[PDB]
Every structure is written in C-alpha cells, then in structure tokens.
C-alpha cells in the first residue's frame, strides 16, 4: 500500500523529467540582469556568487564556470550533464535551477539562494551531530537518492560541503557537476577522496551503488564528527578505503553500527541499496524505525536545528572568500564545445 503510492509518485515524476530531459531550457537570462554581491563559495572549475536580480529584487546563487578552464580539465561532458539534469529535476531536497546562460567566456547557472549555509560549516563547528539529528538528515538523502536513482541518475558527489541548510532546517543538495544519466556501468574517476567507493578507486566499472556507500560515509561523519577514512594525503585514504576495515566510535548505537557496516560493505553484491529490496532494505533498517518518510518528504517534521537568518540577502552563514572580478572576453571562447548549453 505505502510502496504502491511511492511507485506511482515516482512514475509520474519520470514522465515530467523526460519531458524536460528531451527539450532542455536555454538562454533564459543575461548577466546584465543581476548585481553581483558576494562569493559564497569556491569549487574546482568555477565559483558561486550571491547575486540580485535587478528586475524582481530576488537574490539567487549564481554558479560561474570558465569555458576555457572547463575545457583544460576535461569537464565538458560533465558540465553539459550538470546543467541538463538540473534543469530537468524537481524534488523538495534539490536546489532549483532558475536560469542558465552563457557568454564569450563563461557558463552561468542561477539557482535559488539557500541562506542557511553548508552543512559542513555547522558540523565542523558543533563537532558532531546527535544520532536523531543525523538520522533526520540522512532521511532526506535516502528519499533524494530514491528519486534520482529512479531516473537513471547517479549523483557521485555526496559530502557535507554539498548540502545546504534552508530556512526551515531542511537539506538542499547542490552541485550536480558529476551527476550522470546512465543505464548501465560507468567508469569515470571522479568524486571526493573521503567519499569514494572502493570500486571507483579500483577502476572496476560502477553503478548507483556508489551513492549508497557515500551515504554511509556521510552518516558516519555526521555522527562521529570525522569521516571513517581519513589521512593527510589522498593515496593513504584510498588504501584505507580499499582495505575494508572500519572502526566505530564507542558512542554509536548498535543499530547505527549495523546500518553502517551494511552500507560500508566493500562487496557491491552485499551492500545495502544494491540488493533485491533495493532502497527498501535501508528504509526498513531498525535505525530508521522511527522515521515517517512521508512526513519527511512532506516537511512536516520539526527540524532539530534552524540556522539564523537576519535578512534577505544575509550571507552570515557562509565563509568569506577573496573577490575576483568576472571578465567577459571580446572574443567568443569554445563556442562549438558548449553549443547545447
């Protein structure tokens, strides 16, 4: 009965997605229409800025990618994927893409602004989340992957730096830079060291299962306050990852340790989320016995924490970055490559 409503929901969702997937939105705004306020963050190929839309007065977060840099780092296909996918999705815990456009030097993606800041900031500050608090977040991730996976989508970049906290205390997943639509196996080496599944590190060809392993890492990190595999140099991390040995802090409940040992299962064929019951083995786990998935989806649950917002356009919850002026060349750069954007 509950399972059937989901299946239906999902079904209808696949239809809406396909419609956008086949005919993507394009050139919906222009740089001239916004005022650049402040850099909210930094990533590997571009930056994110707080911006204000002259005409409506709303603030948004604008992601900026430099065409040539994208090109030098071989991220063209990834960048087209990111945009094409973001424009097609629709789920309560995903950042909404508002506008997209390009110019001689860059690519722009404008989304709703999520003022609460990165989960990363708070976690590091607090040090660690109480189990129920972490379970609350994890729940949202579960449903999100449930949605995304059903669309043949693989996320590949889960980590607290990618989860923003909204006004209501809920999570918003951002950065679809490695998101891919694939029926079958994939082989690219991408992600964040601490969160990489062994198969990825082992160059074995992987599927949706890497997302579940990552969800395991995230939950451990939220509750312990440190990831399960840490070191100073990536190579050492990968070695610990591959090795298949996990230690848990004395404070984890027996339930949690059980969930975790099943998510952090080196053998894909035994890893929760990648079995006959698929997502159900997770949702059904004793650790989540308390969670009303529906209510979470509905956002009827009281968030355990609510970040402080002092006004629209308030950046208080974000770290400070050095400002770099955006420069638009007189010559069109890499036109061919980004035709579809």
């Amino acid at each position: 009965s509950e399972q059937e409503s989901v299946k239906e929901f999902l079904a209808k969702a696949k239809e809406d997605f396909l419609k956008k997937w086949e005919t993507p939105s394009q050139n919906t705004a222009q740089l001239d229409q916004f005022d650049r306020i402040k850099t909210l963050g930094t990533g590997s190929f571009g930056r994110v800025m707080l911006v204000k839309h002259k005409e409506s007065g709303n603030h948004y977060a604008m992601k900026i990618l430099d065409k040539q840099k994208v090109v030098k780092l071989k991220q063209i296909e990834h960048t087209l994927n990111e945009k094409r996918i973001l424009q097609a999705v629709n789920f309560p815990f995903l950042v909404k893409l508002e506008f997209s456009f390009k110019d001689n030097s860059n690519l722009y993606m404008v989304m709703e602004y999520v003022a609460g800041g990165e989960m990363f900031s708070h976690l590091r500050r607090i040090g660690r989340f109480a189990e129920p608090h972490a379970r609350f977040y994890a729940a949202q991730i579960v449903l999100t992957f449930e949605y995304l996976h059903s669309l043949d989508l693989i996320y590949r970049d889960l980590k607290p730096e990618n989860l923003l906290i909204d006004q209501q205390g809920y999570i918003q997943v951002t950065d679809f830079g490695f998101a891919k639509r694939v029926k079958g196996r994939t082989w690219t080496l991408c992600g964040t060291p601490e969160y990489l599944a062994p198969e990825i590190i082992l160059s074995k060809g992987y599927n949706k299962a890497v997302d579940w392993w990552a969800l395991g890492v995230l939950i451990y990190e939220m509750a312990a306050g440190y990831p399960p595999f840490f070191a100073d140099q990536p190579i050492q991390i990968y070695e610990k990852i591959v090795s298949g040995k996990v230690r848990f802090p004395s404070h984890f409940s027996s339930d949690l340790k059980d969930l975790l040992r099943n998510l952090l299962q080196v053998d894909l064929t035994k890893r929760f989320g990648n079995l006959k019951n698929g997502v159900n083995d997770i949702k059904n786990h004793k650790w989540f016995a308390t969670t009303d998935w529906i209510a979470i989806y509905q956002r009827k649950v009281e968030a355990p924490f609510i970040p402080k917002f002092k006004g629209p356009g308030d950046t208080s919850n974000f770290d400070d970055y050095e400002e770099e002026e955006i420069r638009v060349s007189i010559n069109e750069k890499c036109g061919k490559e980004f035709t579809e954007f």
Binding site: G43, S44, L73, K74, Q75, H78, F120, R124, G127, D157, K159, E161, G177, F178, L189, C190, G191, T192, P193, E194, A224, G225, Y226, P227, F230, A231, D232, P234, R247, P249
Partner: peptide, 20 residues
C-alpha cells in the same frame, strides 16, 4: 583520541573533488 587526530590533520577544511 581519534577526533583529536582528525582535528590536527590536514583535511579538516573543505574537500575539493578530484577528476583526474
């Protein structure tokens, strides 16, 4: 403690993605 070990490690800040 492990936490203390993490705190002193070089990877307490924001972690960038790898691609290559």
């Amino acid at each position: 403690t492990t936490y203390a070990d993490f705190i002193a490690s070089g990877r307490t800040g924001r972690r960038n993605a790898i691609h290559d």
